[PDB]
Amino acid sequence: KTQVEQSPQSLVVRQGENCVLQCNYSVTPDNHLRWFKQDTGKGLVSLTVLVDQKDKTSNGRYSATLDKDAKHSTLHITATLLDDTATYICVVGDRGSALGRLHFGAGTQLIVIPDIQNPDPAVYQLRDSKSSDKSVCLFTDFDSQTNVSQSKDSDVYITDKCVLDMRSMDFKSNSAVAWSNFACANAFNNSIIPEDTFFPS
Amino acid sequence: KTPQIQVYSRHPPENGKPNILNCYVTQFHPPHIEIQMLKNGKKIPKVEMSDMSFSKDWSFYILAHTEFTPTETDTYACRVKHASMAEPKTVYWDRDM
Amino acid sequence: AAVTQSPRNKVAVTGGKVTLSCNQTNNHNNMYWYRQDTGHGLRLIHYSYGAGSTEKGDIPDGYKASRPSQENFSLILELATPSQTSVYFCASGDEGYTQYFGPGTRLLVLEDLRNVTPPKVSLFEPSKAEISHTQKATLVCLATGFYPDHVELSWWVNGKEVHSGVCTDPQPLKEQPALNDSRYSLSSRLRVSATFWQNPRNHFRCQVQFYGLSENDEWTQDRAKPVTQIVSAEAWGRA
Amino acid sequence: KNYTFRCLQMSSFANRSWSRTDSVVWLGDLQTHRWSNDSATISFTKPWSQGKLSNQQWEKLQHMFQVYRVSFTRDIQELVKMMSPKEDYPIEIQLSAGCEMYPGNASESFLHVAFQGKYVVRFWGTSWQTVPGAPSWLDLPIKVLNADQGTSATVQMLLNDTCPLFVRGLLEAGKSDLEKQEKPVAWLSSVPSSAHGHRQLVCHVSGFYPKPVWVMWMRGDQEQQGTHRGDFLPNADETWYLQATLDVEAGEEAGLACRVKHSSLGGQDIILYW
Ligand SMILES: CCCCCCCC/C=C\CCCCCCCC(=O)O[C@@H](COC(=O)CCCCCCCCCCCCCCCCC)CO[C@H]1O[C@H](CO)[C@@H](O)[C@H](O)[C@H]1O
Ligand SMILES: *[C@@H]1O[C@H](CO[C@@H]2O[C@@H](C)[C@@H](O)[C@@H](O)[C@@H]2O)[C@@H](O[C@@H]2O[C@H](CO)[C@@H](O)[C@H](O)[C@H]2NC(C)=O)[C@H](O)[C@H]1NC(C)=O
Ligand SMILES: *[C@@H]1O[C@H](CO)[C@@H](O[C@@H]2O[C@H](CO)[C@@H](O)[C@H](O)[C@H]2NC(C)=O)[C@H](O)[C@H]1NC(C)=O
Ligand SMILES: *[C@@H]1O[C@H](CO)[C@@H](O[C@@H]2O[C@H](CO)[C@@H](O)[C@H](O)[C@H]2NC(C)=O)[C@H](O)[C@H]1NC(C)=O
Ligand code: NA
Ligand code: NA
Ligand code: NA
Ligand code: NA
Ligand code: NA
The missing domain is CATH 2.60.40.10 (Immunoglobulins)
Structure with missing residues (x-):
């Protein structure tokens, strides 16, 4: 259908696992091939450019190969981190000058599931800074095995899980938020939550 | 540049003897050109063309040729249309030249 | 370059x-x-x-x-x-x-621009229970009632944007998924150490930049013209 | 003797959409290749046109030229857009590229480019350069072309290594065609020379190969200094045609012969008496 094809279309790996991304093209001629990383709603960050008939490059945990005879490139990510969660884009330039056109692959979506070492699953109630009759329920500190389900009640709102990274403390935690106008004891009833989940008061 | 046209036979011309007539078109540009070889002012069919080439000076040249049998009566010509000329140029074969 | x-x-x-x-x-x-x-x-x-x-x-x-x-x-x-x-x-x-x-x-x-609406923004302060259980403090920001979904949510401590300990829902959820032009909600967390939240010189702000009408887009409805604008909610740290 | 191998490319660009590229290849005055715009592949015009290249080396070289022809067409169209509206269609580009072969493993390679029929650019050493008299606007095209290190490495290899190697093989493979001897045939004729009492005698010499020939009008042993050689004109069968004219006075025709010397005649000169 197009001149640059990427495989897989998408993949899920666990933190610390390696993965390989493929780029196959029919572009002629093939002056060079670049790998971009694109984080969600952000721009294109160049990881590497390969220029030789048989080429190998490296950039920290990223390494790449190019075989111009096979019209094939691989991007290797060693020991994946949460921050590798992104779309990886293959681009082939058909000239070694500004007379070149770029041929973009449609990208590979990588998700990296973070490693939660010391889970402490809990449901906390938080009050509005202004009108303290308003509140939310925060389900936090669960490991990446726990799935958060949407509510059965359509007047209750529940977000998907979300991992934050307190970088200075080398600490990651999952959370989901629930609210309505309803108590925190009931908020995540429609989800399979750990048996030892802490409900204070 | 305005095309030079030279018309000449491959072999000594003898009335009633098959021969080859050459039309050599040179010193022209741009290379778009129409070359016709004429018998009694009519297009000879199946005229062979060399590949177009160019000289040291970058001007173009091509050789047209065709089988012909000279006679006392029949006239032979090479007619060239080229952007550098308002009208087609016609050069007549003269065996004496 | x-x-x-x-x-x-x-x-x-x-x-x-x-x-x-x-x-x-x-x-x-x-x-x-x-x-x-x-x-x-x-x-x-x-x-x-x-x-x-x-x-x-x-x-x-x-x-x-x-x-x-x-x-x-x-x-x-x-x-x-x-x-x-x-x-x-x-x-x-x-x-x-x-x-x-x-x-x-x-x-x-x-x-059509008829449903364009800016967010309400609410800041939810950390649970005393989270603080005693974890020595950490999670703030939650909630943007509600907005359409369409073109918002940028950012966290500011003492007038400077923070990224560490933040995560924002990857997409807004629909408030009425039955309806054609449903309004959206979006949530974000900022997690800091208890001592950081407990410091009353720390000013916390959740900011939502909303993309809506230009000053030159025509508006025929009674309600306020839903222009591009910032809506925010703030709180100070405390013991 | 020395032989020049000449690859001649003619590219016409009528407007933004229409173009054609045609190539011919010469070893001395013998055609070895043709590449019509209409053809996907380069045509051999001699049995020996592959020289001493293996099938894989020839296929590799042809594939490179196939990509080049497509790439070249787009590059010129883009350079026109780049220089717009300074330069506009129609545009003629000519390339003359090859190597002159000298005794004892010596050769010189060349790649000359003409724009609208004027020599403006060559490849020299490791880059494209304009030549004396070229217009200044070509500095931008040259700067852009010279950014392409991949093309520069390929052109350097073709001029420095591929050309002399290929041509040494062609000279071996084509030896019997290159060394062919074909005998001239001569015949006489006459016309008025736009002078009241003056005749123009014509000595026609045709079918000779190779090119070097001697043709003189003669009264006995006396070489008629008035003899004018025309240009060497090609025959369709890769032989040559030449005529030698002498402006004489009507009546004086008697006693005049045309003498022809050629390597093919083994010392047996042609003498035609009027
Ligand atoms: C028989 C063999 C013996 C050797 C004979 C002599 C050899 C030279 C003969 C003719 C020239 C042939 C040149 C071959 C180059 C082939 C390289 C090639 O692969 O095609 C390349 C063709 O692109 C070109 O190089 C186009 C040719 C250069 C332009 C020629 C004109 C130079 C003078 C400039 C014209 C001046 C007037 C312009 C102004 C007009 C606007 C107003 C494609 O390049 C791309 O792919 C390659 C991979 O294949 C990558 O290495 C490479 O990085 C990337 O950019
Ligand atoms: C190829 O040979 C050139 C020098 O030869 C000249 O240019 C060729 C393209 C061809 O036209 C020849 O007949 C010419 O005589 C090398 O160019 C030199 O390269 C060095 C460094 O690489 C540079 O310092 C010199 O100045 C260059 N010479 C000139 C005159 O500019 C070139 O490197 C050769 N390339 C390969 C890959 O063999
Ligand atoms: C681009 O150029 C081509 C070739 O010059 C144009 O086609 C020619 O148009 C004339 C009519 O004006 C005809 O007499 C020729 O026979 C055509 N030649 C061919 C090969 O088609 C073509 O129309 C031009 N295209 C544009 C977009 O102007
Ligand atoms: C010269 O050859 C080129 C290359 O084949 C021709 O370009 C093709 O023309 C057709 C239209 O007739 C296009 O649909 C193809 O896609 C073209 N091929 C490429 C690679 O672009 C060109 O038309 C020929 N020129 C002439 C005057 O016949
Ligand atoms: Na990929
Ligand atoms: Na697109
Ligand atoms: Na051969
Ligand atoms: Na051969
Ligand atoms: Na181009």
Whole structure:
């Protein structure tokens, strides 16, 4: 259908696992091939450019190969981190000058599931800074095995899980938020939550 | 540049003897050109063309040729249309030249 | 070798005029406009080899290009259509093959502006229970009642943006998923150490930049004109 | 003797959409290749046109030229857009590229480019350069072309290594055609020379190969200094045609012969008495 094809279309790996991304093209001629990383709603960050008939490059945990005879490139990510969660884009330039056109692959979506070492699953109630009759329920500190389900009640709102990274403390935690106008004891009833989940008061 | 046209036979011309007539078109540009070889002012069919080439000076040249049998009566010509000329140029074969 | 784009985000109506601008101080002769749509690589719309030059790319239909100067290359949507909802990338380059990409522009073209509504923003302060259980303090920000979904939520401590210990829902959820033009909600967490939240010299702010109408978009409804605007909620730390 | 191998490319660009590229290849004055715009592949015009290249080396070289022809067409169209509106269609580009072969493993390679029929650019050493008299606007095309290190490495290899190697093989493979001897045939004729009482005698010499020939009008042993050789004109069968004219006075025709010397005649000169 197009001149640059990427495989897989998408993949899920666990933190610390390696993965390989493929780029196959029919572009002629093939002056060079670049790998971009694109984080969600952000721009294109160049990881590497390969220029030789048989080429190998490296950039920290990223390494790449190019075989111009096979019209094939691989991007290797060693020991994946949460921050590798992104779309990886293959681009082939058909000239070694500004007379070149770029041929973009449609990208590979990588998700990296973070490693939660010391889970402490809990449901906390938080009050509005202004009108303290308003509140939310925060389900936090669960490991990446726990799935958060949407509510059965359509007047209750529940977000998907979300991992934050307190970088200075080398600490990651999952959370989901629930609210309505309803108590925190009931908020995540429609989800399979750990048996030892802490409900204070 | 305005095309030079030279018309000449491959072999000594003898009335009633098959021969080859050459039309050599040179010193022209741009290379778009129409070359016709004429018998009694009519297009000879199946005229062979060399590949177009160019000289040291970058001007173009091509050789047209065709089988012909000279006679006392029949006239032979090479007619060239080229952007550098308002009208087609016609050069007549003269065996004496 | 830096490239800038303005605006970074735009909500427009069908039939309206939209101009996407790219500025480059590299003195690059060459500039390029692309759009990025899910399932496709970036596709070239228009390019330019210098001031006064515009050249059609692969998908020029519905776009005019303008290169008034070496510095500025503009993409003009004379009659915007919903099919032009995309992320637009500008790039520049010299005689070399490298294209230096700008950060992208998100354009949404709506059929109609009638449902456009800015968010309400609420800041939820950390549970005393989380603090005693974890020695950590999670703030939650809630943006509610907004349409369409073109918001940027950011956290500010003492007038400076923070990223560490933040995560924002990857997409807004629909408040009435049954309805055609449902309003959206979006949540974010900022997690800090208990001692950081407990410090009353720490001013916390959740900011939502909403993309809505321009001052020059016509508004016929009674309610306030839902213009592009910031809505925020704040709280100070405390023992 | 020394032989020049000449690859001649003629590219016409009528407007933004229409173009054609045609190539011919010469070893001395013998055609070895043709590449019509209409043909996907380069045509051999001699049995020995592959020289001493293996099938894989020839296929590799042809594939490179096939990509080049497509790439070249787009590059010129883009350079026109780049220089717009300084330069506009229609545009003729000519390339003359090859190597002159000298005794004892010596050769010189050349790649000359003409724009609208004027020599403006060569490849020299490791880059494209304009030549004396070329217009200044070509500095931008040259700067852009010289950014392409991949093309520069390929052109350097073709001029420095591929050309002399290929041509040494052609000279071996084509030796019997290159060394062929074909005998001239002569015949006489006459016309008025736009002077009241003056005749122009014509000595026609045709079918000779190779090119070097001697043709003189003669009264006995006396070489008629008035003899004018025309240009060497090609025959379709890769032989040569030449005529030698002498402007005489009507009546004086008697006693005049045309003498022809050629390597093919083994010392048996042609003498035609009027
Ligand atoms: C029989 C063999 C013996 C040797 C004979 C002599 C050899 C030379 C003969 C003819 C020239 C052949 C040149 C071959 C180059 C082939 C290289 C090639 O692969 O095709 C390349 C063709 O692109 C070109 O190089 C186009 C040719 C250069 C331009 C020739 C004109 C130079 C003078 C400039 C014209 C001046 C007037 C212009 C102004 C008009 C506007 C107003 C593609 O390049 C791309 O792919 C390659 C991979 O294949 C990558 O290495 C490479 O990085 C990337 O950019
Ligand atoms: C190829 O040979 C050139 C020198 O030869 C000249 O240019 C060729 C393209 C051809 O036209 C020849 O007949 C010419 O005589 C080498 O160019 C030199 O390269 C060095 C460094 O690489 C540079 O310092 C010199 O100045 C260059 N010479 C000139 C005159 O400019 C070139 O490197 C050779 N390339 C390969 C890959 O063999
Ligand atoms: C681009 O150039 C080509 C070739 O010159 C144009 O086609 C020629 O047009 C004339 C009519 O004006 C005809 O007499 C020729 O026979 C045509 N030649 C061929 C090979 O088609 C072509 O129309 C031009 N295209 C544009 C867009 O102007
Ligand atoms: C000269 O050859 C080129 C290359 O084959 C021709 O370009 C092709 O023309 C057709 C239209 O007739 C296009 O649809 C093809 O895609 C073209 N091929 C490429 C690689 O672009 C060109 O038309 C020929 N020129 C003439 C005057 O016949
Ligand atoms: Na991939
Ligand atoms: Na796209
Ligand atoms: Na052969
Ligand atoms: Na051979
Ligand atoms: Na090009």
